[PDB]
Amino acid sequence: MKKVVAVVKLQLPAGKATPAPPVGPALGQHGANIMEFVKAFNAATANMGDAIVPVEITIYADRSFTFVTKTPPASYLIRKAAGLEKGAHKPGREKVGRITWEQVLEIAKQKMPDLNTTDLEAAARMIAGSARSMGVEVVG
């Protein structure tokens, strides 16, 4: 969310990356290197962890780019936080699993550098809501 010029955001997992399905054409269509990225990516994925890093890549004529990495979707940190494979299909009523007023706060700390709300109650909120977003009631 800065400048724009044929950009193409997209999420990616651990070291695993290159299959055309997830990425592949994902950036090769806008003329680019699946080479200068398949590894260039696993240069920072292998370092931080092995989850799901939302990396939005911009593109120029020199099949160049600026793959900016961010914190995994607030939807991931919330899952494993209660041990849930999928989401829940139909939220708002069935709480497959649940999280506590604190477990939510933890994550909030992990994504506060991405948001735009220093406060830890403000952030935790747009997370406690992410629960009603996948059927995972908040403990409190």
Partner 1 sequence: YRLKAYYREGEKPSALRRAGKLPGVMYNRHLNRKVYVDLVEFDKVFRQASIHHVIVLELPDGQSLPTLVRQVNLDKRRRRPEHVDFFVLSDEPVEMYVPLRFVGTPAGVRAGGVLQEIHRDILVKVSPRNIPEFIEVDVSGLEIGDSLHASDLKLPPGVELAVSPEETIAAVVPPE
Sole binder of partner 1 in the list 91, 112, 115, 137 (CB under 8 A): 91
Nearest to 98 by CA among 140, 139, 53, 38: 139
Question: With respect to partner 1, which residue has the nearer C-beta, 25 or 92?
Answer: 92
The least CB distance from residue 137 to partner 1, in Å, is: 12
Asked whether position 93 contacts partner 1 by CB under 8 A, the answer is yes
Size of the site for RNA (CB under 7 A): 38
C-alpha gyration radius of the chain: 17
Asked whether position 2 contacts partner 1 by CB under 8 A, the answer is no
Asked whether position 59 contacts RNA by CB under 7 A, the answer is no
Q: Is 73 left (phi over 0), alpha (psi -120 to 50) or beta?
A: beta
Question: With respect to RNA, which residue has the nearer C-beta, 39 or 125?
Answer: 125
Task: List the alpha helices (DSSP H) in the chain.
Answer: 25-28, 35-41, 45-48, 74-77, 103-111, 120-132
Contact stretch for partner 1 (CB under 8 A) within 33-41, 45-53, 90-98, 123-131 = 90-98
- Tell me 20's DSSP state: T
Q: What does the binding site for partner 1 look like in residue numbers (CB under 8 A)?
A: 90-94
